[PDB]
């Protein structure tokens, strides 16, 4: 109902899940998916297979709004982070470029005990 | 009196009425703190490396002065008061250290 036909895609990859949002060139999202949106429930969400299926679900939802050209943004390290990217180039959507924007602090906040 | 260098960056949207006023204000602020001006360099519109005050550009100024040292921190306090003024960095002058000479 929008006919955007060009926009951005954000891959948020963690060790517990990989989720994909698709937005217009201004950042406002169109659709999205994740490892939990598809059938997977538990630890299977942070797997490269789930990361692939989640990427492909969003890419087919964006076809309904008419998306052809996509710019990709990647945040976080985790299993299936690369598998989502590879799933996106072959999704039919011509991938314009790929950027890594993973936020790193300048050593500002104290991490949880796990991360120290 | 030591010798310093003044970096002033202000909003790159001012017309000449506001540009003359803002600068003759900077003149008035240096007279009241006792800064003998040695030379001036005005760059103007310059592309910034990141947004400052939501604005992608900045209008740059540079003065080399000689003034009493005790009054420096108060001089910086007087220049930042103006809304149009954005960056005020004052650095004590140094010798031009050459590398690969």
């Amino acid at each position: 109902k929008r006919q955007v036909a060009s926009g951005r895609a954000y891959i948020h990859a963690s060790y517990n899940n990989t989720i994909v949002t698709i937005t217009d060139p201004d950042g406002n999202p169109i659709t999205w998916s994740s490892g939990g949106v598809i059938g997977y429930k538990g630890s299977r969400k942070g797997t490269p297979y789930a990361a692939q299926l989640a990427a492909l679900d969003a890419a087919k939802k964006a076809m309904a709004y008419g998306m052809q050209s996509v710019d990709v943004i990647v945040r976080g390290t985790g299993a299936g982070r690369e598998q989502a990217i590879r799933a996106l180039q072959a999704s039919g959507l011509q991938v314009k470029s790929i950027v890594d924007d993973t936020p790193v602090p300048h050593n500002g906040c104290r991490p949880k005990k796990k991360f120290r | 009196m030591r010798r310093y260098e003044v970096n002033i960056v202000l909003n790159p949207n001012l017309d000449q009425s506001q540009l003359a006023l803002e600068k003759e204000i900077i003149q008035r602020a240096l007279e009241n703190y006792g800064a003998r001006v040695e030379k001036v360099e005005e760059l103007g519109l310059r592309r910034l490396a990141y947004p400052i005050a939501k604005d992608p550009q900045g209008y740059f100024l540079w003065y080399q002065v000689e003034m009493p040292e005790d009054r420096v921190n108060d001089l910086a306090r007087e220049l930042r008061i103006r809304d149009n003024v954005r960056r005020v960095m004052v650095v004590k002058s140094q010798e031009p250290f050459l590398a690969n000479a």
């Binding site: 990217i85 790929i98 | 960056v9 540079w62 960056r87 650095v91 140094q94 250290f97 050459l98």
Partner: protein, 70 residues
């Protein structure tokens, strides 16, 4: 690979206002290059790092950038 000092001129290591030369010492990101890549000396790199940080506050050098690859 070549080093930065190896391919450059006679420049002022203390000038924070010359962005054209200081851009050569930042990486693809806004990060400061290691000594192994800049080809500077102990005293030189310490001076460069300080004039870089100054240019960063003047909005002339970036604090951080975005990598286009991967």
């Amino acid at each position: 690979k070549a080093k930065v000092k190896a391919t450059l001129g006679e420049f002022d290591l203390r000038d924070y206002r010359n962005v054209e030369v200081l851009k050569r010492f930042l990486s693809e990101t806004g990060k400061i290059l290691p000594r192994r890549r800049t080809g500077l000396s102990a005293k030189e790199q310490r001076i460069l790092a300080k004039t870089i940080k100054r240019a960063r506050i003047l909005g002339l050098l970036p604090f951080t950038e975005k990598l286009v690859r991967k």
